[PDB]
Design a protein around this ligand. Sequence first.
Ligand SMILES: [Ca+2]
Ligand SMILES: [Ca+2]
Ligand SMILES: [Ca+2]
Ligand SMILES: [Ca+2]
Lengths: 198, 200
Amino acid sequence: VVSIPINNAGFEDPFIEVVDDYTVDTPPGWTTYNPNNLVPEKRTTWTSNNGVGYVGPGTQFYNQLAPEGRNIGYIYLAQKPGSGVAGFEQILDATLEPDTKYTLKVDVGNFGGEFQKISLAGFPGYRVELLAGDTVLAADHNNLYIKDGEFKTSTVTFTATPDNPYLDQKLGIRLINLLQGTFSGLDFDNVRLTVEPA
Amino acid sequence: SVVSIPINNAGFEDPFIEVVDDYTVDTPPGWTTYNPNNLVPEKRTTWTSNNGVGYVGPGTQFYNQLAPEGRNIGYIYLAQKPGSGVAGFEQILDATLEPDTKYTLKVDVGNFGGEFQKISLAGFPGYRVELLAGDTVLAADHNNLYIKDGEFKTSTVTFTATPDNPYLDQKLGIRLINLLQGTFSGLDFDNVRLTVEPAQ
Ligand SMILES: [Ca+2]
Ligand SMILES: [Ca+2]
Ligand SMILES: [Ca+2]
Ligand SMILES: [Ca+2]
């Protein structure tokens, strides 16, 4: 069982000091997957955005601490349900290899609480995908039920045979806000990808 | 407690097929051809992209087991090269999405083995199983199971609908999809089951 390197895999970069403070720029090491242009290049707290957030004692948004370390990565979409999807993507160094089983695990978070008078109850739905090149090899499209203010672990697996047409292409990961519900924000954390003989 | 939702021709048993390893090339009754990329022609031959049902019986040259359910399986074959698109079966159910309910969709997915007219059937295009409400894919298994030539495995897709889900009261739907991300670019489905139960 081997780990494949992922940059900023727990969104711990940058370090954030204050409880529930967050960034509004793409997490370091990741790019914004934006197939529908929902996330503007220059964002504010009133636009769709993504970034990292510190989950600590005193958080008003969760009933538990970050799955890993201090921070989570979050994606919030302001457009109405059905408008499209957005999230994070990272292209890895490793390439697809035959006779190997891949295991992608990532923690998915559903916001909780209330701010002002508005509640964060609700979830847009998630999809976690494992890629080779531009191809989605395997994906978990919203299979887990996650309660408000909680996290749960998603597992995606894929076995690559010697005749798989995408061998030698770069592995990739996408973490996606499906925007099929409100509250239309979600979190991810603790991304891990391992390989083993198949 | 756990209630089954009615699905038409859910084991692809209609039409009856008499001869082992014989197949149809027209859309199974009760299902529609899901064709977002126009890969499947309206009129099909044995060698066009096609779909239909097939009898998997004793003596079959294509699997190491019989159909997971009954006599027949439903299949989808795509002749275009990997990366061209996807196609499969779709059925809209009569039931609608209900609040505070957990849905469990199960379908057996089959990987052909053997050879047909000297063409090797080894390989798999990848599959996706989708639960939908209206036009929305609520939950889906995109190719998570590894399935060897000549075998079947059960895909499980779960979804929990809360009271504020925007798609409540829209009609439930199912899609069984050939991903066309490998050759041999055909696969099978069987034994579609959908249950609903209270979640919370
Ligand atoms: Ca973390
Ligand atoms: Ca929520
Ligand atoms: Ca059957
Ligand atoms: Ca095969």
